């Protein structure tokens, strides 16, 4: 079990039923791969610096987790199956290196 | 037979030749011109003068469609790139913005022996 950050960028044009559904599916996927959720940041709609999936903007969520290492890659695969999820980036957690400090 | 009046002017400049394309604001070309469009044939098509005359021909053909404003998009490097921007500015078309778009790879493809 290590400490990770799961980034998910999904389609901004979803309504509430839809978004809630993709989100719940994601929850289920984490629970299935044994990922405990330490904290969550959902920043939502933001303007991408380049268009992704013909959309100028995207919807952002961030999940800090602790999960089994061996499963992590697999977890990623699952999250990508959904069409509505444009980006998935899983990152091993790091301490906040500081500069001009 | 259009009445466009605002749009894009693309200047594609290589060492061999210079070509200009005047287009509508959503990207579809209206008129175009090049070194060879005006009488030049060989190496002579790469001179800055050719670029001048090509910009000017293109701007004429623009006036015929009733063009006024132009956003310039510059691609490539060759002689008379700047001469084409120049001629285009003093053409009677009033330019809005000039932009260098020259495409560069992130290193995809092997070049020909001449280019390595």
């Amino acid at each position: 079990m290590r400490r990770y950050e799961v980034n998910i960028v999904l389609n901004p044009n979803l309504d509430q039923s839809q978004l809630a559904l993709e989100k719940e599916i994601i929850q289920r996927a984490l629970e299935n791969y044994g990922a405990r959720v330490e904290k969550v940041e959902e920043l939502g709609l933001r303007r991408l610096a380049y268009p992704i999936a013909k959309d100028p903007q995207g919807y952002f969520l961030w999940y800090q987790v602790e999960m089994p290492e061996d499963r992590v890659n697999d977890l990623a695969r699952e999250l990508r199956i959904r069409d509505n999820v444009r980006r998935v980036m899983v990152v091993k957690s790091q301490e906040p290196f500081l500069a001009n400090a | 037979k259009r009445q466009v009046a605002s749009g894009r002017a693309y200047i594609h400049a290589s060492y061999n030749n210079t070509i200009v394309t005047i287009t509508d604001p959503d990207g579809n070309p209206i008129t175009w011109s090049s070194g060879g469009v005006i009488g030049y044939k060989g190496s002579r098509k790469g001179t800055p003068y050719a670029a001048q005359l090509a910009a000017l021909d293109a701007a004429k053909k623009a006036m015929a469609y009733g063009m006024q404003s132009v956003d310039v998009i510059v691609r490539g490097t060759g002689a008379g790139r700047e001469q084409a921007i120049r001629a285009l500015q003093a053409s009677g078309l009033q330019v809005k913005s000039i932009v260098d778009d020259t495409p560069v790879p992130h290193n995809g493809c092997r070049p020909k022996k001449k280019f390595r």
């Binding site: 380049y50 290196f97 500081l98 | -």
Partner: protein
Amino acid sequence: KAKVKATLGEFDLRDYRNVEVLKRFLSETGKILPRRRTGLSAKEQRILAKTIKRARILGLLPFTEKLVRK
């Protein structure tokens, strides 16, 4: 010329999600600025590169831009 780091507070060089800061390390174009501009140390720079590239992958930062004037 005053370096990018010179105007900034204590800031995470590891935060790929923070655009408001990271933008200042890129040129007119999309390019990651040289140390001569960013004022960073070797290690600092080396981290900032990774962070930027991560953010780029996430669409939060541009891979390339276009040059005005000219």
